[PDB]
Amino acid sequence: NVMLESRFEKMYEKIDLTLLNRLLRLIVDHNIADYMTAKNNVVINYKDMNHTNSYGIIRGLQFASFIVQYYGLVMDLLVLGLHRASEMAGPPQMPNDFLSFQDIATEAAHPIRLFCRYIDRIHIFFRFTADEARDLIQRYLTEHPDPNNENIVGYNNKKCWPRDARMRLMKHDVNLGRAVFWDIKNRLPRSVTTVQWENSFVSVYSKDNPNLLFNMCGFECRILPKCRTSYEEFTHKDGVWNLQNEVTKERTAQCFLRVDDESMQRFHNRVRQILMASGSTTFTKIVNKWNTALIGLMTYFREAVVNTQELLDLLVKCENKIQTRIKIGLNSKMPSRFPPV
């Protein structure tokens, strides 16, 4: 079972206006589509310098999000393929849920079992038999020979996990991941969009790899099936999602959660810009900004803080930073036994 999570690198700034207008006329009244496309073609100004935005779209337009979503749908048709899309969406009279199939047969017919797009981050989940994986690997290696086994060098891995939890870079599995990525990249034209390997993660669960690693919505998640390498299905660890099958109603898999490194970096940057923009600012404003950031992080990433000890350290460090800033604001000298009241 091989996952590919990536993103369209420049889908915002590499949307042609004529193509967008033609594709919008397909779904909305041509006057509205022409208006929107012409609205995306306006003069961008800043200080003494301005230019004419003629190639890219402007993300600041109120309707722009819709455009992007529609454009993303087109990208899906390029990646999924219309038939497979109709296999996942279902009949037009009876559409399926987000992740559900009309029957097991159409689920197992095609390698692409799950697929979500979000705004620009595409997550695809393939299942592969041995022969299909071998054929894909052979087809990839036919045009990209690698006698020196160099495919393991440029392989992004989730370093935030221990060695056993991390992806095991077996030669067959590395080759399969590269082949899957190349197959997906082939479907998308190089001009309408682009998918770059280094800004992507391909994680394969096989005999060698016992853990499936993926990342979405700022969550670094790892799935460990209970069948192979789960000596204890413990419950005390609150960063664990006891995944349960809908048929056997058993604990088939264990889901370990973690806060993504990008989210931690964003939170640290937010706290840093809160603190550094406090030369002339009331203490209550600073505390309110810190409180808002903290509730946002903790409510969004609940159950994912507990496993991210680095996040706990960063949180307490930033809280101490806020307290130190307030204390310096009070008096220009550090208190020795300051109280928390």
Binding site: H236, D238, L312, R337
Partner: peptide
């Protein structure tokens, strides 16, 4: 009693998250 915030890594693992909330 120092007034500094201590990191709760390796701490209070005897408590869940749904506790102390109705």
């Amino acid at each position: 009693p120092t007034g500094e915030v201590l990191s709760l890594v390796g701490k209070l693992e005897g408590t869940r998250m749904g506790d102390k909330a109705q």
